[PDB]
Amino acid sequence: EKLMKAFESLKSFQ
Amino acid sequence: PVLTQSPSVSAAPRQRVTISVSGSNSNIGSNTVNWIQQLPGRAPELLMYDDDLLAPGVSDRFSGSRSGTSASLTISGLQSEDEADYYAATWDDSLNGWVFGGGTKVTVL
């Protein structure tokens, strides 16, 4: 789930 | 921004630029780092994830690393299209949420 969690950090960022 | 990054960095074409970030035990010290690239005028996209792994579609010229409370992004063969702002991201166990670097701007010549 590393990649997914990383996309969620982008969602939170932008 | 909970993560500390240098504001800007410049280099000539084909040179290697290293973007560093330093956090603490609760963030970079125990969680993995992500890198976010935002090109001029464009939306930000995932560049790197899990310290050293490239996001789907990203150039192989990017490499990453994390040790202790610090992490670094490395662009090799610096090209004009890398001219952007780069953001370090990771989870913080103390704040129970995402934390981000201020951003490092890259300028080519």
Side-chain angles (χ1 to χ4, degrees):
Chain A
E1 288 181 64
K2 277 286 170 192
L3 181 56
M4 190 208 175
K5 200 188 181 180
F7 277 123
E8 292 166 58
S9 68
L10 184 89
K11 190 200 165 190
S12 175
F13 179 60
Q14 67 164 31
Chain B
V2 176
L3 307 174
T4 308
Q5 282 186 240
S6 203
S8 69
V9 68
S10 294
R14 296 182 313 278
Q15 291 308 120
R16 180 175 290 116
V17 292
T18 309
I19 298 156
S20 292
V21 59
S22 60
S24 56
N25 297 343
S26 64
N27 50 64
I28 302 183
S30 50
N31 302 283
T32 60
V33 172
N34 303 332
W35 290 98
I36 295 171
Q37 180 188 48
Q38 188 178 26
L39 307 181
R42 314 304 298 261
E45 330 286 4
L46 189 63
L47 188 78
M48 298 205 73
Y49 76 101
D50 190 20
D51 304 321
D52 50 45
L53 301 168
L54 298 160
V58 173
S59 174
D60 58 271
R61 300 192 288 103
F62 296 91
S63 48
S65 178
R66 167 181 75 116
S67 64
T69 52
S70 74
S72 60
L73 180 64
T74 299
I75 319 169
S76 280
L78 193 73
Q79 284 168 25
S80 193
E81 61 160 285
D82 300 325
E83 205 159 294
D85 295 43
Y86 297 83
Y87 301 87
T90 188
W91 188 268
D92 195 293
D93 288 356
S94 192
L95 298 161
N96 200 53
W98 296 112
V99 289
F100 308 101
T104 307
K105 199 177 180 73
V106 170
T107 292
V108 194
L109 283 149

